[model samples]
Target: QSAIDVVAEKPSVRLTPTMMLYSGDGSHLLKSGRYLQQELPVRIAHRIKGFRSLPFIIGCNPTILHVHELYIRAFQKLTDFPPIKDQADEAQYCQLVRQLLDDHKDVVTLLAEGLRESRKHIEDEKLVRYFLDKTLTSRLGIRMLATHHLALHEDKPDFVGIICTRLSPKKIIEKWVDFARRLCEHKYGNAPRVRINGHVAARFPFIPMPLDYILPELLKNAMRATMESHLDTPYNVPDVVITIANNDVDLIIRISDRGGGIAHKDLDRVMDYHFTTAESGPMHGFGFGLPTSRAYAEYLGGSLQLQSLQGIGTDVYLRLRHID
Candidate 1:
């Protein structure tokens, strides 16, 4: 076994979301108190451990150590603050958590640097999964922290502030489609064609960040597949289609691509963490996009599904529960 193999063990800790905001009525903090209480701690602990696992070498060691110290200090300070009693206290707590999230990103970058170096020796799939598991868990915790704060003040039973505003589904899709096209055009002289069809009239409440992340990743995947599938026959390159739908309880976004579909054998593994069909290592690979995107979907109490027909096409569906 290689020396790098020693890094394969999962992080020693898990992170769970922790928040202190008494419901306005002074009885509860969040509508779904149990979910946050149960999940956030596991999430936070994992992230802390993941960041700690990076090998301290040369330029990387200093930054990683600094982040490790920051995590310790911030976590300690959190306990110093008392439970939030009102919106005023909640605001202060939010700022504290927000600051930690910002600092946490620096840690994320430092860890990514370590992964970029380690990717050569460690199994790509394993490392990617491990890295993302730590990264996504922490990020979701931040979001949940803010969400709990919002849900506390909003005081509406059954409504978690997953979506702060109503967004036009069509506009969001169009914006990302254009963004993806330009990105592809820059990479490949010609962009794979894209068309948005289906229910354009639907408007729903959605989390901007998660939706933003989901749309772009799916579009890039479709564009890449279409481009590669048609490299030999430009005329056969197909346009990606985005369809949006809203029902009584859920909002669904489906993206379809005519690029050759995924192999039947790989279909089940599509959402597996760190799994990718790309040949490159960490730098230019499909390491975290789909898995993280799915994580984002499920974090908001939604689901992501993929269906592919070999030599025919692939379709991705993102379903988000409506916050009524």
Candidate 2:
């Protein structure tokens, strides 16, 4: 129907988390970059196809159209690039990828923003949920392809592109906790301390970016609830507690906050895409986190769940299987 529709017909290799672990493990960066050169265009093509099918109500906006063109054009440019025959071609390929990643970096938030105003007219909430879920999920995977190529070239130890083979959960938690706490303190004049327990020293193969997104988002929500509920008693804010444990099946991390738990009505809906309970505007970038987090978790054979107690607190369990 449209120019963007052509690229999707060409089948592309499906990627799995295990596929990422061994793709270029033996310092075969060129090989990995080449794999990406072929794969990125296909995935981008698929994303453009996703955009093309957007509901007339959703797709008509200039905003949504802008993103559609962005992807379609990117797919064209990437496919047009001559194959990576050597260092020069691959390096130039990296430059294109770097720009594309940055160009597409905010597309998720952008898409989320456009959908909020169309809520009632969207036919049904579940459809939008499914639509946004698949859309964002694929976006994550496609972006990962090109980024791994770039990161692989940047050449960081303990990282095969963006996959971290020795990621420390506590270290990551501490960083986000500190960040969220500072935000809480700025807003409510107090910050909750965090206590980490269980396998604090555990290290394993994992993608750090998704966790980076998941942790900061959940923690900020936890902190926001804590501060807003306890604002009258700033000095007595409770500490958020976190625990990390992993076994044969999965590496599990649990976070508990005394932030006056979510209402029962909102529990099941929190992780649905294009959904939110925040009092602020429709897209404070707040609502996009959980569902995307779950996408990342489950895509790698893991889970993310929450148990919220009405008047007391909430506990979130995030499990990610060891990737190596």
User: Model-by-model lDDT, in order?
Assistant: 0.63, 0.78
The residue pairs that clash in candidate 2, if any, are none
Error of 2 at 48 (Å): 1.7
Clash count, candidate 1: 18
Specify the highest-lDDT model's number. Answer: 2
**Positional deviation of residue 79's Cα in model 2 after best superposition, in angstroms:** 1.3
lDDT tens digits, residue span 1-324, model 2: 354466587787766767767675433666777888888877877877777677887888777788787877787788888998777787898898888787667776667666766676787767777777677667777767777777876668888778888888899889988888887778777888889999988888878877777888889878788877787898899988899997767888898999899888888778877567666111235577777777778876788898899899999999987765
Give the TM-score comparing model 1 with the true structure, all chains together: 0.67
Q: TM-scores of the models, in the given order?
A: 0.67, 0.90
